[PDB]
From a paper:
Periplasmic binding proteins (PBPs) from bacteria undergo dramatic conformational changes upon ligand binding.
Typical metrics for quantifying local structural perturbation, such as changes in solvent-accessible surface area or distance difference matrices, identify residues for which the change in local environment is defined by the three-dimensional relationship between residues, but not their sequential relationship. Thus, we analyzed the change in dihedral angle (defined by the Cα atoms spanning four residues) to identify maltose-dependent structural changes in sequentially adjacent residues [Fig. 1(b)]; this analysis shows that the Cα chain is “torqued” around residues 175 (ΔDihedral = +41°) and 311 (ΔDihedral = −22°) upon ligand binding. This yielded variant MBP311-cpGFP.L2-NP (-AsnPro- at linker 2), which has a ΔF/F of 1.0 and a Kd for maltose of 2 μM. We set up crystallization trials with MBP165-cpGFP.PPYF, MBP175-cpGFP.L1-HL, and MBP311-cpGFP.L2-NP in the presence and absence of excess maltose, from which both MBP175-cpGFP.L1-HL and MBP311-cpGFP.L2-NP crystallized in the presence of maltose. We solved the X-ray structures of these sensors to 1.9 and 2.0 Å resolution, respectively, by molecular replacement [Fig. 5(a,c)]. GFP-H148, meanwhile, seems to stabilize the conformation of linker 2 of MBP311-cpGFP.L2-NP by H-bonding the backbone carbonyl of the linker 2 Asn.
Residue numbers in the entry: -3 to 397, 415 to 476, 480 to 619
The structure:
Amino acid sequence: RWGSKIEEGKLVIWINGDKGYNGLAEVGKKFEKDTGIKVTVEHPDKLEEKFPQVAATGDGPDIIFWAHDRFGGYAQSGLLAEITPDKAFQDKLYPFTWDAVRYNGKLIAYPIAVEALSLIYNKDLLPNPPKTWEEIPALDKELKAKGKSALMFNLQEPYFTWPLIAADGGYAFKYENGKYDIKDVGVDNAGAKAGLTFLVDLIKNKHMNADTDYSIAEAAFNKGETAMTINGPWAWSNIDTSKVNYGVTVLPTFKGQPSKPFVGVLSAGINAASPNKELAKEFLENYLLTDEGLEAVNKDKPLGAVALKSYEEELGGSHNVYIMADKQRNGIKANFKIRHNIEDGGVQLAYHYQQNTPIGDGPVLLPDNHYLSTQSKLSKDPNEKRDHMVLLEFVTAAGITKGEELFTGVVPILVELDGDVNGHKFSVSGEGEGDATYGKLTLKFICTTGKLPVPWPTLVTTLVQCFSRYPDHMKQHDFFKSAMPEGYIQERTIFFKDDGNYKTRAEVKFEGDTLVNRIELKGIDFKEDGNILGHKLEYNFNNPAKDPRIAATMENAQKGEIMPNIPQMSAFWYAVRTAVINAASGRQTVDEDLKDAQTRITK
Ligand SMILES: OC[C@H]1O[C@H](O[C@H]2[C@H](O)[C@@H](O)[C@@H](O)O[C@@H]2CO)[C@H](O)[C@@H](O)[C@@H]1O
């Protein structure tokens, strides 16, 4: 019918009231300073409901911030402009974040950050938080005797109860090669019913109240009245302020399975009715999606795991082994940072650089960018009198969403290392076994020359990533197994912060039916009284993340499932909100409530 009501030569931004809007307004101010384009940030109530209404009239903000789930219904209605970042810009964000903001293939928002719920706990009330939902009733009873509760969280919004509902099988819409079946809905299967029954049981047994909402839970946790809550990264600042000694960790399991929170990509979309689309583009691309821009928002209220690689590298500290194809060497490179705990406190950084080149001239898989997530545990064999290390490691590939035949069983491993650190020569032999099906390494190492002159934990990375578990969907990214049996050369430099460096070269290959890692290490420039040569590192491989809260967010997100963005998501949310609220409050049984939700969603 008519023209836009939105004013030219300025930007009006809507963002939710739980996000860092004062921080974003600081980015606005800098933009205004540089360009003369005034930026107003607003945080209206129920803004995800008000946008489609005002935007259809040709009105509303120039930019709207929300999790990516609602943007497909906006895009279906013609309310969002197709965005046009070029290849160079797109390469600056994780690929998977761009996929969250596609509607019929087209990019319709800029991803900003990847959000998942975690378990937030009070370390003074609960130094070891529960691994299982099932143990929380007894924990509540114990805490109640001391006038505290175990757990309070927002039961009024379905986003917060969904991790429990989905844990044993509930799902929103079924995904089947390419799209969501709008008629195959998982809110009323056995798994959803069991989660929602567990929640209702908590309320019947008086471990939770039906009326707990976002404000009540946050105030209870921040005043030290409940030992746990469930919330997202945006809430961490208010906790910081309260001075409660908190941790953020993996959500509890239910019937043995991880909780499955929905994964939201906070995203910024451009109103189709804005006459300021180029200015909005410049703001989001050249001001907000920069390290300085995300930091201003992040310092206000934490974003989580940001979409922008450069700033996620600064926040996250390169926790995982990050792998890239090195086409020139028909191989790969990798970098990552290990953090070794120092005995009476502190952390000793070890910056790792890596490259692998196949030995044989035969074909190998060159992967897309991805990472390996590694967990290691160190122990001692009480019968072993030589200086030694017992290692158990688990490794899995992630980071996107024939030699392999030599690894389908359990392979014996042998390791030989000749070292020279500041002229101090030493040798290590190891043996054990790898089970690539489970990503599992079990090994024992001995210093064959007497006392190891460096801490054992500093040699863990040097002492067979062919034993990583690459899931089905990622097998084409496994360079390591594809090199075998002839194998590969692996080279590293490892720089120890404020101290020396290791340079390593290894051949990793089958000799007969044994996987053998033969290594030469040279250490130069170390301090004799430093952490390494002075043996000041704790004996473990805890390798804590720079920010354990971000690590816990990504752990929970990988166990979760990306929100669909289909227009039917608004009927989904309404239907589950109603079913959960009803069931909690004793209106109808869990079965009837979830059945009504199913019927409403699929109509
Ligand atoms: O509870 C339903 C609601 O869940 C999600 O909203 C989250 C949002 O993603 C987070 O950024 C944060 O603000 O908490 C909200 C829950 O209160 C969906 O994104 C949203 O569309 C849906 O209605």
